[PDB]
From a paper:
A systematic investigation performed on a range of protein crystal damage series deposited in the Protein Data Bank has established that Tyr –OH electron density loss is not generally a dominant damage pathway in protein crystals at 100 K. Full Tyr aromatic ring displacement is here proposed to account for instances of observable Tyr –OH electron density loss, with the original myrosinase data shown to be consistent with such a damage model. To better characterize the reproducibility of Tyr –OH group electron density loss in irradiated protein crystals, we have performed a systematic investigation on a wide range of structures at 100 K. A subset of previously conducted MX radiation damage investigations have included deposition of readily accessible coordinate and structure factor information in the Protein Data Bank (PDB), providing an ideal database of protein damage series.
Regardless of the feasibility of a radiation-induced Tyr –OH damage event within crystalline protein at 100 K, Tyr –OH density loss is in general significantly lower than for Glu and Asp carboxyl­ates for doses >1 MGy, at which de­carboxyl­ation events were reported.
Residue numbers in the entry: 20 to 120, 124 to 464
The structure:
């Protein structure tokens, strides 16, 4: 995309901590940038929309190349962050409102480095990543997500010279779902064969998808939470078409370059329904804030080893809370993501181990070694109504069959039109982000 001249781009300042030992950290003066999908797209030498509602203008965008020549994405000024997009920062806390009323629904954002010209790339192997979260106002059907993806640090600017904005304009998004709803891919409008998504007034799908590796630290609302590894072959940003995208709609979910299911550790799905929930007698009380700690263990305990284990623990009101465990007869009580856990649990659930097909923890680790961009988002799910996270999936499945039940939400929950009314004022908060060696962040 070209860059427009109507509004300066002003990312929100967000300090994080880089740590060397427990309680010995230094501030890193980073910032938050809005994903290019949420930006106004208009004519390069005017005010005329190139995209309105869920459609590209066919006169301006008869082809992707012409669209890209004629159109530009514009900046987010400071005033518009809260007023238009529902984003705000207080000290080291970042807040994202779900619906902001001209009416904005959801948000996806990235962490910029201290220069505000590149994404802050995190080399996560043999490191610990930690943050405080509040998901108390997110119920069934919503997801306040924090995760990493194998985006380029410059959003693709060096690879795709028609991308003028780079990381500064939140470009280059890709993930392990190979999404077609990304409006700008490889420096070009994804306007070919663009199709609105029914019941989604703001979104559509273009000819291409954009694939890359994804490490989900946090997919969650107050009812259920998960962390998940998604390797791809290769891991780096890859524009896809046809079978390579692994499109759900053509029966290709397991035929593409990315592991779409991922290998998940989701406490409720692993059959501990009392670990996490909205109340003081759950082990971890989702009505109150808490700290989420993630440790990425290698084979030799060094930065050069292969990724072998994703460990997790929590801190809430000064109380250390170890992760829940897998709880099925004849299955080891795993409390972390490893290749063995993935094989054993997917075996039990009858899920295809595409994680293993894509190179497993080792391949996931190669993405983490090269460095990944931090994503913070809030969203509802127009495909599957978040049932995969917090309900029975498939909805018609027996909840006593291992793998089906992922949370207590009813199978009628999560319809975007309903959650966008009922949960309009939901806000996820991510704060006090800390990064360092294992054992350094609490």
């Amino acid at each position: 995309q070209n860059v427009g001249t109507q509004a300066a781009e002003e990312p929100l300042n967000l300090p994080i901590s880089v740590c060397t030992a427990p309680g010995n950290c230094q501030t890193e003066a980073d910032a938050v940038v809005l994903d290019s999908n949420w930006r106004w797209a208009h004519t390069t030498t005017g005010y005329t929309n190139c995209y309105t509602g869920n459609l590209w203008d066919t006169t301006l965008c008869p082809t992707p190349e012409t669209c890209t020549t004629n159109c530009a994405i514009d900046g987010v000024p400071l005033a518009d962050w809260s007023g238009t997009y529902g984003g705000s920062v207080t000290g080291n806390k970042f807040n994202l409102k779900f619906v902001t009323v001209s009416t904005n629904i959801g948000a996806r954002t990235f962490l910029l480095d201290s220069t505000k010209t590149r994404y802050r790339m995190f080399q996560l192997l043999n490191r610990e990543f930690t943050y405080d979260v509040d998901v108390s106002s997110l119920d069934c059907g919503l997801n306040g997500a924090l995760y990493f993806v194998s985006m380029d640090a410059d959003g693709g600017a060096a690879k795709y010279p028609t991308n003028k904005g780079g990381a500064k304009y939140g470009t280059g998004y890709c993930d392990a779902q190979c999404p077609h709803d990304v409006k700008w891919i490889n420096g070009l409008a994804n306007s070919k064969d663009w199709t609105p998504i029914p019941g989604d007034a703001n979104s559509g799908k273009g000819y291409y998808g954009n694939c890359c590796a994804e490490l989900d630290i946090w997919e969650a609302n107050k009812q259920s939470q998960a962390f998940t590894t998604h390797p791809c072959t290769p891991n780096d940003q890859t524009r896809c078409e046809g079978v390579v995208c692994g499109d759900n709609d053509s029966g290709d979910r397991y035929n593409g370059m990315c592991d779409k299911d991922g290998c998940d550790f989701a406490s409720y799905r692993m059959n501990d329904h009392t670990f996490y929930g909205p109340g003081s007698t759950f082990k971890l009380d989702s009505t109150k804030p808490f700290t989420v700690v993630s440790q990425f263990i290698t084979t030799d305990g060094t930065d050069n080893g292969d990724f072998k284990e994703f460990r997790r623990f929590y801190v809430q009101n000064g109380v250390r809370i170890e992760n829940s465990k897998v709880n099925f007869p004849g299955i080891t009580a795993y409390d972390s993501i490893t290749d063995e856990m993935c094989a054993a649990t997917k075996g039990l659930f009858g899920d295809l181990d595409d994680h293993k097909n894509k190179g497993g923890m080792k391949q996931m680790g190669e993405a983490m070694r090269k460095g990944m961009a931090l994503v913070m988002s809030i969203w509802d799910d127009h495909d599957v109504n978040m049932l995969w996270l917090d309900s029975n999936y498939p909805p018609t499945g027996n909840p006593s069959t291992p793998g089906v039940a992922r949370g207590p939400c009813p199978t009628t929950s999560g319809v975007p039109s309903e959650v966008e009314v009922t949960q309009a004022n939901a806000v996820v908060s991510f704060g006090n982000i800390k990064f360092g060696p294992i054992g350094s962040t609490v």
